């Protein structure tokens with residue numbers, strides 16, 4: 087102990103959230119790992135496999151009791167679902183979650199699956215998937231949703247916690263205000279076009295080419311909270327609506343089940 | 355009883371290997387995927403235009419490839435032809451995904467099997483610079499740079515918080531590189547992380563974000579208008595050009611020469627780790643607008659029994675040809691658990707308990723019935739291998755000039771015969787060689803995009819069948835793709851505007867999938883059964899080298 091310990095649990099994930107983390111330009115994952123944290127367990131990157139890998143997670147939990155951070159990627163089949171739907175080293179994800187968070191300082195649920203249930207939880211939920219906050223109640227939990235979240239939102243939250251020595255201020259769903267405090271639609275560069283009644287009617291008509299609003303093609307920006315419209319993606323390169331596709335709503339609970347992606351809602 | 359490695363790390367997703375040992379020799383191996391989501395079941399009833407966004411989230415390491423297979427499946431079902439610019443843009447995004455994904459597989463997932471990080475701390479920084487410089491023109495090679503890299507790793511290791519290096523297999527006799535080569539590879543590992551996050555900007559330009567860019571059925575969502583503030587224009591196209599150049603440089607100067615220099619110390623790995631002899635490609639990457647297999651950069655076909663003189667034809671729709679079996683998988687088929695289903699008739703009914711799944715906490719699988727969440731795909735009853743080795747063999751067999759030159763000059767440098775391709779080494783080498791082929795092709799598709807736009811065609815989306823009311827009330831189609839891990843297909847059946855069935859068969863499904871009703875092993879299992887010995891069952895680096903050479907992805911394999 088001396089760099090704070092971080093344990094990364096990967097459950098029913100697609101590994102998008104870890105890839106996103108490796109995209110972040112500041113602080114980079116390598117600077118974090120060498121200089122700022124001690125990333126003590128992470129399946130994607132671990133030299134050791136099998137019991138040597140499991141022993142590293144357990145020794146981290148032993149030596150940093152009360153102090154380590156847990157980051158969880160993916161939904162977890164709940165304790166009423168078959169323990170065999172998702173296991174590591176012969177234990178269920180649910181068992182590993184509860185045992186690893188028991189002595190954490192805090193838990194970050196990264197990605198909409200961990201935060202809210204996400205894809206494995208979309209109808210009809212064949213594996214009884216659940217979110218971290220539903221399963222873990224006696225711990226501070228920070229939700230950092232998105233599918234995946236923006237890379238510099240992930241490291242932004244981590245840098246906040248490490249540099250300023252506290253949890254970010256959260257909205258009612260446990261999401262950091264700095265990144266999730268404003269809707270896409272209240273920041274979107276097509277918004278004044280929306281308000282003038284200028285809309286694209288396909289992906290490459292005059293309105294699409296000119297950056298008219300994507301509302302008629304299904305955009306869920308009006309009810310979606312994320313930093314894409316201001317911070318943008320991949321070191322400020324672009325974001326989904328700037329590249330010509332409607333926002334899918336991918337940082338909102340149950341966004342997979344909001345009717346079709348290409349259908350407008352019934353009002354605002 | 356069996357030796358167990360669970361988790362396999364440095365892959366994507368959740369993989370357990372069990373091995374029945376005979377002395378130091380692997381006698382039987384078993385490959386088990388230990389997480390399922392049932393995305394196929396999630397899709398039923400939904401809009402086919404939305405499918406791509408769901409199945410892209412099968413996997414964020416091979417991000418893009420299920421989006422592409424999905425919109426192609428819909429386009430196949432509905433017979434939508436793409437505009438040329440859409441097809442070029444898709445090729446460019448596919449090439450960018452291969453290059454990103456292979457380079458990170460090699461450094462960040464595979465290389466710690468071959469590279470001893472503790473040994474790098476002993477290297478002389480000057481000798482490390484001489485070696486780097488004797489193999490490559492890559493600029494970043496100064497002795498002070500190697501000494502500064504070594505010092506950062508030395509401070510880390512000496513802090514006593516070894517992080518992802520803790521309990522590693524450092525000093526195992528399977529590690530053979532000199533300290534200098536280890537330090538060089540570690541420096542390149544770190545350069546590859548900076549390079550990859552820059553490369554990812556390419557998908558963000560066309561697709562809005564990476565991971566998980568956007569797609570649409572019928573074209574690409576990003577329009578082209580040179581006179582617009584909100585479309586692809588000369589400014590955005592100039593950024594794309596620079597990204598292709600940094601891709602080319604990193605492949606030519608860092609990834610390929612490192613793969614070749616490291617291979618020279620592991621030539622005996624050219625004699626193990628390929629136990630099937632059969633390879634399958636659907637092919638991909640057309641020169642023009644139409645998805646016509648005659649124009650593919652990667653050809654469609656199958657090789658049987660290591661015979662490169664006959665390419666067997668592949669039919670994606672023949673119900674006796676591609677089938678998935680569940681004789682040793684945790685699934686129930688209404689036709690009987692011994693039957694194979696073609697994916698138009700696929701079924702995904704999860705059944706752990708009744709198929710012999712063992713209740714956690716457990717120490718051993720029961721391998722007499724279901725032992726995996728992977729289905730077992732077979733091609734006309736055969737176990738096959740897909741992925742870079744299958745592609746490079748197909749290219750070689752069909753007379754692709756550049757592939758032939760690269761394969762010949764590689765084997766010649768290593769002094770190895772053609773049959774060393776059929777191995778853990780050859781697979782790892784194939785991955786690097788096909789990266790070189792793809793990175794050279796990128797310039798041709800980019801130039802063809804610019805020329806097409808310059809001549810006045812700025813179309814990017816065929817709207818004609820966008821509305822469900824324009825579709826037949828029954829349609830079915832297959833979307834094929836050569837994903838970085840191998841042949842990928844999505845079979846869709848559409849009824850009355852809705853998904854009636856959707857079945858994915860994914861490259862790591864083929865390779866990692868378990869035994870079938872004849873006891874015929876899958877690629878990983880037959881690979882471990884081919885000429886492997888473990889020095890130490892607690893540090894099974896020999897298993898990892900071969901398993902990692904397939905670049906496993908279990909979120910893809912199981913979905």
Ligand code: SF4
Pocket residue numbers: 098099100101102103159160196197198199200204205232233234235411414
């Ligand atoms: S939120 Fe999306 S990107 Fe992250 S694990 Fe869930 S599916 Fe993957």
Ligand code: SF4
Pocket residue numbers: 270271272274275276277278280298299300301305306307308327333
């Ligand atoms: S509907 Fe979408 S595209 Fe239109 S202004 Fe709102 S967020 Fe932007």
Ligand code: F3S
Pocket residue numbers: 232233270310311312314325326327332333334335336337563
């Ligand atoms: S789909 Fe997701 S990435 Fe941003 S623009 Fe919409 S919240």
Ligand SMILES: [Cl-]
Pocket residue numbers: 109110111236237238239318319320321322
């Ligand atoms: Cl970013």
Ligand SMILES: [Mg+2]
Pocket residue numbers: 394729857858859860912913
């Ligand atoms: Mg499937």
